[PDB]
Design a binder for this molecule. Sequence first.
Ligand code: HEM
Ligand SMILES: [Zn+2]
Ligand SMILES: [Zn+2]
Ligand SMILES: [Zn+2]
Ligand SMILES: [Zn+2]
Ligand SMILES: [Zn+2]
Length: 454
Amino acid sequence: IKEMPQPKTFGELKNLPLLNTDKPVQALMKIADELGEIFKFEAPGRVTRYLSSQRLIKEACDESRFDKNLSQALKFVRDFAGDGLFTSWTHEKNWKKAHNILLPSFSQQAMKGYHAMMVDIAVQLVQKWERLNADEHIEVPEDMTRLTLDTIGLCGFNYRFNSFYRDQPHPFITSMVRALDEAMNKLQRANPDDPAYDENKRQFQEDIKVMNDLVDKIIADRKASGEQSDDLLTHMLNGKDPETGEPLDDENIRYQIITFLIAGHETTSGLLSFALYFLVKNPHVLQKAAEEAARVLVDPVPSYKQVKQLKYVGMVLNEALRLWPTAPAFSLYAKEDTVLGGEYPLEKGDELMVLIPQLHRDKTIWGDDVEEFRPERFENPSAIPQHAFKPFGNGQRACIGQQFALHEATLVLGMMLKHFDFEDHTNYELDIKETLTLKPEGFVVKAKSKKIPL
Ligand code: HEM
Ligand SMILES: [Zn+2]
Ligand SMILES: [Zn+2]
Ligand SMILES: [Zn+2]
Ligand SMILES: [Zn+2]
Ligand SMILES: [Zn+2]
C-alpha cells in the first residue's frame, strides 16, 4: 500500500478552495505537475483521486472494473440536461435506450447526410471574413462558437439560429450559457442558501424555462407537423430501441436536444480555436496544412470525400486535442473493492478523475518534446499505445459526437486555410477560459483573403 500525496488543505473545506477559481482544471494540472501521477483531493465527506499517468489511467479505463461517474459538476448540469446521454448513469434505463437509438445517427456514415448543412454554415463563416474591412480583426472563439452552435441547430432540429446575422445571441443561447455558468459557480459557494444567491436562483429558473420552451415547443411542433426533415429530432421521434421496442419519451428527447446544443456551443468551437492558435504560432505547419487544403479542396462547395482526404489537417486537429483536450477531465467510480496500480486500494464507489491534459503530456509515452506542437506525431496511428490518447473519453461512455466533431472541424479548418492567410497581429498570449470546456479567451487574428471565390 503506497500513500498518496495531497495538496494543501484550508480548514473544514479541506482541498475545495483550490478549485474555487475561474480556472480549476489548470489549477489541477499545476497540482499534478507538483505531486505526480496520482494525488488525493478531499472535500467534506468526499475523497477523489486525480490520475495523470498512462500507467494508471489505462487501468482506470478497464470497463470491467470502473464505470463513468457523475461528478458534482455533472449533477448540477443535470438540473437542465436531465437524463440525456451526457448526464446519465450507465445503468439508468434511458442511457442504454437513447444510446441504441442514437448511435446510427452519429456514425461516420451519418456524416454524409449532415455534410451539406455543415458546409452551409462554414460558407457563412468564410463570407463573413471575406467581407471585413482592412482595419478589422477576427474574434476567433466567438466566430467558431457561432459556427458550431448554428451547425448543430441545423443538424439537430432544422432550426436557424442565424448567429452570423445578430448582435446579441439568440435568447436561447443567452439562457443556456448563463445556466452553465450558474451550474459551475454553484460548486464554489460555501453557503448555497444564503440570501445573496436568491437572484441567482430566480435567474436560473427563468433561463431553464427559456430553454425548455424553445425545446418542448420544437418537439411538439415537429410531432404535430409530421415533417420528416432528416435530422436528429426525426430519428428520436421515430426510433425504437431494439432491446425493448420502446421509443424515447418527449421529456428525454428534450434533454438530448439540450445536451447536443450544449456540446455544439462548448466543445468543437474550442478545438477549432486551439487549432488556429497553434497554426499561427507554427507558420511552417500552417503552410503545410494550407498546401494540403489548396490541393484537395478544389470545388467551391467541398464534398464529403474531399474532407476525408485532408489527412494533415486531421493530424493538426489531433495534436491540438493532445495539448488542449477541450473537455479535459472525466470521472469514474470503482465497480467493486479493488487495487489500482498494484499499490492503491479502492473501496466500491471511490471516484477517480482522469486529467486528460496530463495523460497527454506523459513523457514515457510521447517522449521529451511533449510540450511542442508537432502534428507529425500522428503520422502512424499504430504507434500510439492503447489509452494514451483520450480526448473523447473512454469505452461505451466515449463521446457519441466524435465523428460529428472531427468532420465539422476538418471541413472548417480546411476552408479557412484554403481561403485566407492569417496574421497573429497582437502576438496573442494564450489565456484559457473554463466553462464546461476549455477555450482561448481573447484570441484575435487578421485574415487576408487569398481571393478564391466560392
Ligand atoms: C472536439 C469536440 C468534442 C470533444 C473533445 C468531446 C469530448 C467528450 C468527452 C471527453 C466525453 C466523455 C465525458 C465523460 O466521460 O464524462 C463526451 C461525451 C459526450 N459527448 Fe462529446 N465531445 C465533443 C463534441 C461533441 C459533439 C459535437 C456532440 C453532439 C452534438 C457531443 C455529444 C456528447 C454526448 C451525448 C456524450 C455522452 C455520451 C454517452 O455517455 O453516451 N460531443 N464528449
Ligand atoms: Zn475584438
Ligand atoms: Zn455564446
Ligand atoms: Zn435519416
Ligand atoms: Zn469494501
Ligand atoms: Zn524542442
